[PDB]
Amino acid sequence: SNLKISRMDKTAGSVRGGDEVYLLCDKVQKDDIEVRFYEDDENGWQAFGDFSPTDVHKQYAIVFRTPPYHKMKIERPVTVFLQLKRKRGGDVSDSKQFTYYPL
Amino acid sequence: ASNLKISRMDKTAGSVRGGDEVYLLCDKVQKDDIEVRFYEDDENGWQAFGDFSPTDVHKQYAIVFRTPPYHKMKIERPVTVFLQLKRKRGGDVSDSKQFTYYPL
Question: Cystine bridges: which residues (chain B)?
Answer without folding.
Answer: none
